[PDB]
């Protein structure tokens, strides 16, 4: 085995609140004197089909919003919209507010979710932003408004908020400035995700992790070119590899003494011939939810 670890969640736990609007309850993020949650909290079951969020929000008063931080009712003194995120000004700055930034991540990048039920931390898991900007994850009992995050030194980088589930049962949401990842809208209408491809650079990081942990059967004599690798990659629904992806893998190459194009040759054969009933780090499938950065972090 080689464990998919989440970041420690403590700094995020102290920021999770319950947000209620009528019969709708979901999770909010309480930073300084502002609570962030999905704007679709202001919607009635009717409204969700084609909501006019400006008209719906104009109709709401400060007192239509119930914010609970543990046992404390917070006083809403202001309500506003940044894209698809509702911003509730409360009369108290969160005294547990960590140092934080809002970042927009790239498809293939990983992050931790603190899954919450009615403002209460329930669980933490590590996932990837799929190439089609969806998230495979949490069963979702009152999971709307649960946030994704990286910890960078002493700083929480908030990168994601859960808004909705798609037909396929994958999840979609926004950055903390309320812009969707992918072509999705907070409207109850049938919306297609792109083809979900495998994150090749992550699969290569994980083969590197397998070698570091002494799992070596899949190494072959062969090398390959980026060009010839990418033709095979595209046949099996794998993202094309670029020189930047080669450069990103450099530390794992140097540590293992296995060139990137030699590991690429190993992956090529695995795709063409399958695993012949064998496993790598105790998985029967190639794992793509570890970045090169994740493997380096955990192999130190």
């Amino acid at each position: 085995g080689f464990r998919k670890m989440a970041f420690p969640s403590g700094k995020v736990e102290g920021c999770m609140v319950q947000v209620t609007c009528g019969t709708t309850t979901l999770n909010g993020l309480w930073l300084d004197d502002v609570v962030y949650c999905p704007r679709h909290v202001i919607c009635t079951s009717e409204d969700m089909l084609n909501p006019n969020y400006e008209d719906l929000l104009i109709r709401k008063s400060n007192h239509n919003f119930l914010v609970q931080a543990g046992n404390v009712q917070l006083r809403v003194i202001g309500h506003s919209m940044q894209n698809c995120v509702l911003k509730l000004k409360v009369d108290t700055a969160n005294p547990k507010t960590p140092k934080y930034k809002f970042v927009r991540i790239q498809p293939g990048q990983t992050f931790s979710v603190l899954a919450c039920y009615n403002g209460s931390p329930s669980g933490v898991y590590q996932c990837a932003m799929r190439p089609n900007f969806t998230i495979k994850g949490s069963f979702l009992n009152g999971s709307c408004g649960s946030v994704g995050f990286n910890i960078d030194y002493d700083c929480v980088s908030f990168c994601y908020m859960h808004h909705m589930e798609l037909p396929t049962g994958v999840h979609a949401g926004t950055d903390l400035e309320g812009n969707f990842y992918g072509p999705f809208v907070d409207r109850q209408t049938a919306q297609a995700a792109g083809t979900d491809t495998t994150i090749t650079v992550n699969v290569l990081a994980w083969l590197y992790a397998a070698v570091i942990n002494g799992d070596r059967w899949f190494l072959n004599r062969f090398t390959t070119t980026l060009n010839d690798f990418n033709l095979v990659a595209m046949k099996y629904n794998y993202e094309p590899l670029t020189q930047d992806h080669v450069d990103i893998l450099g530390p794992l190459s140097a540590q293992t003494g296995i060139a990137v194009l030699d590991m690429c040759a190993s992956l090529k054969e695995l795709l063409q011939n399958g695993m012949n009933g064998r496993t790598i780090l105790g998985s029967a499938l190639l794992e793509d939810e570890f970045t090169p950065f994740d493997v380096v972090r955990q192999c130190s």
Partner: peptide, 4 residues
């Protein structure tokens, strides 16, 4: 599905 945006329930909840």
């Amino acid at each position: 599905d945006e329930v909840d």
